[PDB]
Amino acid sequence: MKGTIVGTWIKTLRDLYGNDVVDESLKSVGWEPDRVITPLEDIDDDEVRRIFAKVSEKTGKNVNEIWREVGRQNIKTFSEWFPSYFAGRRLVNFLMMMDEVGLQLTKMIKGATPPRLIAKPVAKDAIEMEYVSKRKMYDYFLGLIEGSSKFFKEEISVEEVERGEKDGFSRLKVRIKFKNPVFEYKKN
């Protein structure tokens, strides 16, 4: 992972489980607890895995459970560090623009690999969004969706439709229903 995202994870882990659980976790992987991560730096995904695994051991929660909680809370963290992606927007627009944001990011940041989040309208009040990655972070993805709903204070229901791996790609498709109509039919 690029250092920007990893940095938000550390902060979010602290906010959720406290400095002690986090200090010992970073130490367990030979990191300095107060490590400063630079935005463009690359962090070994395996070291992250080991950190979250230690968090799991210390807190008693399973790793999946932790990733779901981090997903929910990290939206707040990210919104603090990068408000321009949230400013003046509403949930539906935020969710539908995110795939392009990732593709743009990939081009502007060497080595960055944000997952695909292709979204499409399926009803006047609903979209489908498919997470496609090399990384299988299913619970984090689901958590981020829930976190977005809280941040924007717009209630939604999320229904998982597909999950599975193929050709080394993890895929997870959800149907997200909004309270009010967000789409209308227009001539093509």
- Which residues are near ligand HEM by CB under 6 A? 1-2, 4-5, 78, 82, 85, 98, 101, 105, 112-115, 117, 133, 135, 137, 140-141, 144-145, 148
* Smallest separation, CB 152 to ligand HEM (Å): 11
Nearer to ligand HEM, 24 or 31 (CB): 31
What is the SS3 string spanning the chain?
CEHHHHHHHHHHHHHHHCHHHHHHHHHHCCCCCCCCCCCCCECCHHHHHHHHHHHHHHHCCCHHHHHHHHHHHHHHHHHHHCHHHCCCCCHHHHHHHHHHHHHHHHHHCCCCCCCEEEEEEEECCEEEEEEEECCCCHHHHHHHHHHHHHHCCCCEEEEEEEEEEECCEEEEEEEEEECCCCCCCCCC
Residues with Cβ within 8 Å of residue 34, at least 6 apart in sequence: none
Read off the amino acid at residue 26.
L
**Cβ proximity to ligand HEM, 23 vs 29, nearer residue:** 29
Closest CB 102 distance from ligand HEM, rounded Å: 6
- Minimum CB distance to ligand HEM, residue 14 (Å): 19
Of 127 and 144, the one with the shorter C-beta distance to ligand HEM is: 144
Least Å distance, CB 42 to ligand HEM, is 8
C-alpha 33 chain-centroid distance? 23
What residue is closest to ligand HEM based on CB? 85
**By C-beta, is 17 or 140 nearer to ligand HEM?**
140
Q: Which CB atom, from 141 or from 178, has the smaller least distance to ligand HEM?
A: 141
Q: How far is the CB of 20 from ligand HEM (least distance, A)?
A: 26
Minimum distance, C-beta of residue 134 to ligand HEM, in the bound complex (Å): 7
- Residue 21 or 102: which CB sits closer to ligand HEM? 102
